[PDB]
Design a protein around this ligand. Structure first.
Ligand code: A1D5Z
Length: 182
């Protein structure tokens, strides 16, 4: 079925991230880790990919975001740029939504789309339909209501799950993103 056990890919993880031993949780650290500058690693924001690659088909996973003031979630092309600054944009191979400033939910269209959520999500579901060209986000706290769906996505090659537990801010947003057991 579509549900997939996601694990995080340590080789992609920005040095400001701390991954759990089981690679099912990620949080912001208070200082940068000393780790390699390999080509796969995101170097400018606290971002990490799932290890799994999606070439086709339907895939679903859930993430716990309880109480965090910021986070970003979704899917991206494996071929996205890893080094440097960029726009988390569905014009650049990212299909993402995010929260920042405790209450500002946005979809990563270009320009960005403000999202009005009646029930702040504590868990988010991400449904990828490769052949349908869609990435859809569901509010598990609100009986699975639709947060946002990207459609007409140009998918070529493998996609990857995408995560950020926040940006660097001073160490306030310290709780992890946790991949829910399915
Ligand atoms: C504009 C778009 O390209 C972009 C790129 C990288 C990131 C974000 C947005 N934001 C939202 C803006 C935050 N900023 C004002 C300090 C994030 C939200 C949650 C976790 C990480 C991030 S990093």
């Amino acid at each position: 079925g579509p549900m997939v056990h996601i694990t995080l890919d340590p080789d992609t993880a920005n040095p400001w991230l701390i991954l759990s031993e089981d690679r099912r949780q990620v949080r912001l650290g208070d200082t940068q880790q000393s780790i390699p500058g390999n080509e796969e690693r995101f170097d400018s924001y606290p971002m990490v990919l799932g290890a799994q690659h999606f070439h086709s088909g339907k895939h679903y996973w859930e993430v716990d975001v309880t109480g965090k003031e910021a986070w970003a979630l979704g899917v991206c092309r494996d071929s996205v740029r890893r080094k440097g600054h960029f726009l988390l944009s569905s014009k650049s191979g990212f299909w993402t939504i995010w929260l920042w400033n405790k209450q500002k939910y946005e979809a990563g269209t270009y320009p960005q789309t403000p999202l009005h959520l009646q029930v702040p999500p504590c868990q988010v579901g991400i449904f990828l339909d490769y052949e349908a060209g869609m990435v859809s986000f569901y509010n598990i706290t609100d009986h699975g209501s639709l947060i946002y769906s990207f459609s007409e996505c140009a998918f070529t090659g493998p996609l990857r799950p995408f995560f950020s537990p926040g940006f660097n801010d001073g160490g306030k947003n310290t709780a992890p993103l946790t991949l829910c057991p399915l």
